[PDB]
Ligand binder design. Structure first.
Ligand SMILES: *Cc1c(COP(=O)(O)O)cnc(C)c1O
Ligand SMILES: *Cc1c(COP(=O)(O)O)cnc(C)c1O
Ligand SMILES: *Cc1c(COP(=O)(O)O)cnc(C)c1O
Ligand SMILES: *Cc1c(COP(=O)(O)O)cnc(C)c1O
Ligand code: NA
Ligand code: NA
Ligand code: NA
Ligand code: NA
Ligand code: NA
Ligand code: NA
Ligand code: NA
Ligand code: NA
Lengths: 380, 380, 380, 380
């Protein structure tokens, strides 16, 4: 029925055999066959299928309202598998500010295999239509994006993709299936870095993919089996376990996000704040139309590198580390940690200023997170 | 010093911090930074590097006498990473009877990305020289191969590759580093399905890669980080644990292999036996020159499908399952399980007869394995 | 600062060495010594101390505002260790309705070792004073109790224990440290079946003990080391992980508990409801004075065995299984599952009627849990 | 049939449900019941029984030729459970040099519960007969003992126990079931610290118990369920995995033991050597009558503390750490590490001289272990 119930009872996460109320961890590579070709429960080799992996695959399919789930050894392994649906000479349209690892994979790996990519500003969906070439096969969209949280209209992207025969893909990592369901809006394939919110505890690197399309699912299964970027059973188990509390975690994070944004907007040492909940944010109305909650990632401007570093030193409850979606609140400086490759003038042009801070809101008490960040900002 | 000592004390498999005599399992995705960019021990994000994965990587590099190790989510993920060293338009020479998963990946995935492949009979190394095209970049060799155990001269392959500027790769799964060290013979890259002998216990799917080449290592690290087919920490730990007993297991397997082959050659219901220890086997002398032991995989002919199936039913200690390198002895019928896709007439032409049986010798008592298989053959 | 923050940042649950943001899993039994007797970080043998176990021990000590934590292989192993603080001839006072496993251990194991026990109704604390013998050494109190949720005044129990030289112990399983802190009220020792709420995911059997008393801690450490009921590192890790979401889970459970109790009190097929939040419940005022929330365990009466069984069959979201504190809502019938040993007439006398149902409220959506249980009650 | 085959195929270590060739890890606390009291496969609560624990229990029962197995959180938890078969006023006879942890448990824990113990020299079995009191209920024997490897006649001990109505117990840790089977010689109960050889990889703390006696098994099951010192599922799994290679490891260790003892006896810086394989060792003939191999623990005398410490510093392949039965060879000095509590004069009287060295032989190459220890002895 409701979302918090579906998180607990959706998917197959018990043992039919013993009745165990959690998925057994099948730390195994192969399976007895009673006769040649007769598989007791359909398992024959863990790369092809593993019962613990099958459990987390059924969870993500259920939560995204798809039919088929796939678990990969990382988010970028999921992305790489989806890109390998295409051939040399095929073309992909992506949003201009995709995740750095996605940008790296596409422009430094798959470009050597002859896949062509263009990065366009998808906040206006007619820019997608202009970029469509005769060779375009795929539209790949993150929303909201990192680190400036640009929003793309998912449903219009799906219609454009359908009209032009494109496979549509949404990287739904930042919103999670608790708040945004791209398959319900016509998207062909949805994927996640489960390393972030889904696992939720900073202790699994994993990617998840769901689709309702039988033929796309069969092609993904073939690629997964052939290139072998499969999630292991122990990580599959920890993913299933972490997903149980996804709703509670996301709701705590959202309460804190609202209060933190009020504080940031009021504070004199903060300039621009980037988050889709802000009413003046581009495509705010579009985000509310396609999601019923918010990501915990917020970016905001302080004055310069020195203020950003002192902010980090002065906070007691914001932890300096890579990644997002932890139970701890995380803090980082994109210009130094994710975009330090880009020359400074182009960084500034894109809005990645020296004093741009990104926080990933965790599940600490709301008042503590607000008060801690405010008192640290007061030291500026 | 000697091999069994190096298995125990080679690589870094203790905890410098606590002194723990086994590698801690870092079930973690990210790492505190004391200041922006300052990593306490060089770790920042588990996809890029994880201390448990680093441990198994240092073991495989040590055991193969290389400098750099890489752990992937499966054997075929390791193979896929190595193939991705090449670009569209590049050409690969492989032995004609490569592992089915390798054949599938190359001819159904990477061919769509414009990598060109030819499968040639490398048992004569001048067939490699004939196949070399202006676009050839890589020579990929398994030895001995599956399921007929064809042997390829590793050292001459390495010289040919050096002379023509080719990256040379050996799939060393069947022999393990305990018996065959391709990097010592001039090969650029050695790889393994650690799913088999290295893990040794049928409970991890994993691939391992080693090289001494700094620049190839840097390219593999970039591909691993970008396409994300990384082995998880729990599987990395179980791999390190299984490798400790590799020498004892391989030596038990070899004692049984010798006795089983004597029995098979003497038995009237057995026709041809395929194994590199047989003196009339093609390139027997070459195998002894490049290895100091034997794989546990043996193939042999019985009369037909019915005899093969009754053999399986009559054995008490041979287990019908996919994979090899278990502690249990495994039995299978290639024509029904690995080559059933190939039309029957071409199967017979290649020597994959209906009555071709493959066994993977385990670590059960030698006399039991010999006696069990003999009494089952007597029922034919 | 506030409770939800302390759950995330309290205790030592990172790796000082690598910076890993989660506790490494030390699957290890022993530790290198640089010289005889010099331990790098104080570890020498995992039974005596293990760094992953040390992490969960520091969490429970922090959450209960104690100084010393201890992790055992189960709740009853923790209880057994605490009982072994006493000698033959010593006497224990416990509440009359202690957990069945505690009753079993005391009256069928430790009674054979000459420990004497009396079970008294501690809802009136003067009954403790009357039961105190010259040989009494320990007062052991659960509050609230199972399955009728009787409440005992913790602070008065602590004063009585101090006045008469008794070691005071509270089994704080049902309330968790999120809502009730016995050490802050003068109790000597607090313990938990971490199998329930603390782990929270039905996937660890474990006991935890905390104290502020240096000398009691030293005696518990000696008993733990000597009788060896230690929690393993993998379970220790999963406990630390589950505790992160304890606050969010308990708060969801409490919202559902309030609404479910309203429904139960209004429903015509329900007679008596047992829960400390009900204002007419014995020692309701005492519970509010010593706790700032509620357990998720509720008991209530339907008509008979048949109604209880049909209730179970008609619910979609209440799961029939043993244990409590899961993310799933659990349902059971004490007279058939925990008290079937007791003759029926004595069952009825104690209030364990045939139609007494116990539910453990999980973290499903509140409206679903209320509506599901109501519609099932309507079928009666 | 033969021992190495029984190690692989004995016990139930596959999944009947999926066919998985390894035991699934049931990281779970509780189990769905289809109706009240109807258990799908007999499981209801993991403390009472867990399917992964059940697997390792069936292995130890099979390997010791018993009927019932029990897995505890440590060796001393197994010992404590067996001691709790007795009541206050009952008396136990143990060998005079039992393991220090066993001595500690008995004389500092269970003595407070009124169990009486006498430690006698069981190398002459008539000393057992003399020590038998009217209150004696149990005979507890280690053979061979630590650190001087005294041998006790198991079969005569069993007959004495039967004649006088005693429960007989053998701590079979040092020999393992691969070489010595006390239940076959009439002993009632056999137990192990699986922390040592059985796990074999220094990464599990665990105890195992086997018996053929239905009534003793029922009493052990009740004590295990009631005091809760149960082994967890992950450790149970690693135990099952480690036991697979027990035969190969023990045989490698035995080859090295023979050669090392030759070297030690010939070396001028070595005085007495203690090991049951030495023909002049007390009860050498008795050991050969009840075992078909040897423990890897050897003790030998050098001159003094300084020589012992320099020996440790000069070895490359002997590791200074607590415990035994690792894949690594371990070295220690009892007078400083296990018997430093005992005054020096009594240490010397018992034979625990300052220069007494204990080694636990691992699975490194035999020639390396011999040569390394010899060259280090030459520096004396
Ligand atoms: C309610 C519920 C569903 C239905 O989810 P929708 O959001 O309506 O698609 C599925 N599974 C479970 C377990 C549920 O409780
Ligand atoms: C002997 C030894 C080596 C050297 O191995 P080679 O085969 O000579 O290359 C390396 N590491 C360890 C731990 C050794 O014992
Ligand atoms: C707030 C806080 C504490 C203090 O907890 P009290 O309830 O005041 O005893 C301890 N640790 C952490 C991490 C905290 O945030
Ligand atoms: C041979 C064998 C046995 C019999 O063992 P004994 O030592 O004769 O008691 C039991 N189980 C298996 C799997 C065996 O192979
Ligand atoms: Na479900
Ligand atoms: Na669709
Ligand atoms: Na080493
Ligand atoms: Na080279
Ligand atoms: Na902390
Ligand atoms: Na106190
Ligand atoms: Na078996
Ligand atoms: Na007997």
């Amino acid at each position: 029925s409701n979302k918090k119930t579906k998180l607990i009872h959706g998917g197959h996460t018990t043992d039919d055999y013993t009745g165990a109320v959690t998925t057994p961890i099948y730390q195994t590579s192969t399976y007895l066959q009673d006769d040649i070709g007769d598989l007791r429960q359909g398992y024959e080799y863990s790369r092809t299928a593993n019962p613990t992996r099958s459990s987390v695959e059924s969870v993500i399919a259920t939560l995204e309202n798809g039919k088929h789930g796939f678990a990969f050894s990382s988010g970028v392994a999921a992305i790489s598998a989806v890109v390998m649906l295409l051939d040399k000479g095929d073309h992909i349209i992506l949003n201009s500010d995709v995740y750095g690892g996605t940008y790296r994979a596409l422009t430094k790996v798959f470009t050597r295999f002859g896949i062509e990519v263009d990065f366009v500003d998808t906040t206006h969906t007619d820019s997608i239509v202009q970029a469509i070439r005769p060779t375009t096969k795929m539209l790949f969209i993150e929303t909201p994006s990192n680190p400036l949280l640009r929003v793309t209209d998912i449903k219009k992207s799906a219609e454009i993709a359908k009209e032009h025969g494109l496979i549509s893909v949404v990287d739904n990592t930042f919103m999670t299936p608790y708040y945004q369901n791209p398959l319900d809006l016509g998207i062909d394939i949805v994927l996640h870095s489960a390393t972030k919110y889904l696992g939720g505890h900073s202790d699994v690197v994993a990617g998840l993919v769901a689709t309702s399309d039988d033929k796309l699912a069969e092609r993904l299964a073939f690629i997964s089996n052939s290139t072998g970027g499969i999630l292991g059973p122990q990580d599959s188990y920890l993913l299933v376990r972490g997903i149980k509390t996804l709703g509670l975690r996301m709701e705590q994070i959202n309460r804190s996000v609202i209060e933190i944004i009020k504080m940031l907007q009021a504070h004199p040492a903060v300039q621009q704040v980037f988050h889709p909940s802000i009413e003046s944010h581009l495509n705010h109305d579009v985000h509310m139309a396609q999601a019923d909650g918010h990501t915990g990632v917020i970016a905001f401007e302080v004055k310069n590198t020195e203020s950003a570093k002192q902010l980090i030193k002065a906070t007691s409850y914001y932890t300096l580390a890579e990644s997002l979606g932890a139970v701890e609140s995380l803090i980082s400086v994109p210009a130094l940690m994710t975009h330090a490759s880009i020359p400074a003038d182009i960084r500034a042009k894109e809005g990645i200023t020296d004093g741009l801070v990104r926080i990933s809101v965790g599940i600490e008490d709301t008042e503590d997170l607000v008060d801690d960040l405010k008192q640290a900002l007061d030291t500026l």
